[PDB]
Structures are given as structure tokens and as C-alpha cells.
Ligand binder design. Sequence first.
Ligand SMILES: CSc1nc(C)c(-c2ccnc(Nc3ccc(N4CCOCC4)cc3)c2)[nH]1
Length: 325
Amino acid sequence: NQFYSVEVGDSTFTVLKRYQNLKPIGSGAQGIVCAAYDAVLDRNVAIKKLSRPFQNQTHAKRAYRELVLMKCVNHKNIISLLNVFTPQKTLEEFQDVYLVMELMDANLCQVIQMELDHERMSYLLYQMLCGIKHLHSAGIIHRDLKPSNIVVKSDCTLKILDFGLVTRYYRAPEVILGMGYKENVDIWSVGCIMGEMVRHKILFPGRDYIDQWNKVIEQLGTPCPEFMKKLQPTVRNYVENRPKYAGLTFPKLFPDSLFPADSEHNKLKASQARDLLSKMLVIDPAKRISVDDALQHPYINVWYDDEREHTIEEWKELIYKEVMN
Ligand SMILES: CSc1nc(C)c(-c2ccnc(Nc3ccc(N4CCOCC4)cc3)c2)[nH]1
């Protein structure tokens, strides 16, 4: 037989025999991930199992989305699919999907923990922005970018793992407050990651939505009252009739002591970094920098040179065909 089974975490991966020595390298909600040796191609791969894609609408829609976009999207800063398979032989038996992609060497959480280096941070942020730009050009606004869905090779090449849409640490104010969004929603998430590379602390932790919002305004200040008028009626009473917070300036939010010091080079880079932070970490999306302007920012520019609803049966059929195709 062409398949074999191996126990992975709490579950069972059933894979083609080309894929050998499966070891877990991570998990997300969407499914669990193994490194493996692909003996046919003679290289290492990452293998993700989708168990309950067609269990319910939510799971099926996202599985179908992930599968179709991973096949249709080709960009250096988006993870590439190498193979797709199911061990089941017919539609009736069909249960699981396995996605095989290129293996990276670390998550962004690990790189965030390393000492601050301008050329690395600049490069990582350029690549993230390149990836985001390309998704937006294809009509995909991510809305869920976070360190745990970004991976990197040891040479600092960066790859976004997924196409997006609790712990809402990286989500933009407009999304948390449910107030409609545009492309620059993803810029907030980049700003949260950039600040975290500098501070080595999650910028905006929170027990829940309320405290999450509190922590943003604590730091950035309560926004201009024009912003609140766009809030659904009760969200608005909360925000509007809370206490006015004067936040902190960007030099106070990210002091000189966090950055390389005592050369003009490092002095320039520190203020470019803080300048970029101050344009991304902006509560009101109408004042937040765009993807294109961020690519042109002097800290970054050194690197230039459907939704329709289905039944369960139908989602299963659509997914199956996408796999078999
Ligand atoms: C939701 S998490 C996730 N999903 C996928 C599809 C991946 C993925 C995709 C491609 N490559 C990797 N390479 C990779 C990432 C990290 C590590 N580390 C090894 C030590 O322990 C901490 C992580 C090892 C290898 C991971 N990650």
C-alpha cells in the first residue's frame, strides 16, 4: 500500500510513504503540522492535516479558501504548496486533506526574541509588506496577521502561512470594534509586530476585548471624537463615555535604550523606525499609512530595486474535487 500511519501529537497522520520521519513542528486551530523528509523530491517538507474541514460551515469555508488560494497564489513571501492528498479513495469515504509545503526553519515568535538588528527588522518588514501588497492586489485582506502565522528560513526569507479570515493582540481597532475595514487593516498588524521586535513584549495584551481596547488607548491615547461616530450604537457609549486617555509619544513608547546607540547611523535608524511605527500604530484607519507608502518609507525602501454559502454535502464535494484536481 501507498500510505502509512504515524501518531502525531494526539492524532494520527496517514501519509504517502514518500513522507518519512514525521516530527511535529507546530500547531494552529486550522490543523497540526509536521516536518518530514520527502524521499521522492529528496528534500524536507512541512505537512499540515485538515481533519474536520467539512464538519461545519466555518471549518469548510476556511478549508476550501485555504486550499484554493494556496494553489492559485504564487509569491516569494507566501508559503508555497508542493502537494495535496487524501488517503481516502472516494467521495463517500473522503475525510482528511493533507497539505504539503516547503519547510522553513523558524516561526516569527523566535526571530522576535533575538536582539534588535536594523537590517534584519527592515528586511523582515519589507518582505511582510511585499506579501501583504500581493494579497491585496488579489483581493485578499488578511485581518489576522500575527507572529504565529509567519515563518522564516535561516537566511531571513519570510513567508506568510495563510490568507486570514479569542486573543486579539494583533487585530486592528476597527476590527475589534466591528466598524468595517479596508486594506490598511493589515498595516496595524505589521505595526504590532514591529513594536514587539523592539520592545520584546506584546504591545497590547489583554484578558479580553475590553482590556485589549483599554491597553491600546492607554498607550496611543483616546482618538479624535470623529472616529467614534462610525461605531455601532452601544460600542459607542462604552468608548465615548469612558475616561479620556492622553497616551505616550513614540520616543516614550520606544525609548533610545531599546535601540542600538552612540553612532549617527543608529540614531538615524532609531528615528526612522519610530517614525514608521508612529504611522502604522494609528488607531483611526483614515490616518494610518497605506501599504504603498510604507514600502516607500525610508526605513523600508532600501530593499526596493467567492463567498457564497453551501450545504455540508456540497462543501465536501467542492473540497474533494479541489484535492483530486
Ligand atoms: C500554525 S503553525 C505552522 N503551520 C505551518 C503550515 C507551519 C510551517 C510551515 C512551513 N514551515 C514551517 N517550518 C518550521 C517552523 C517553526 C519551527 N520551530 C521548531 C522548534 O519549535 C518551534 C518552531 C520549525 C519549522 C512551519 N507552521
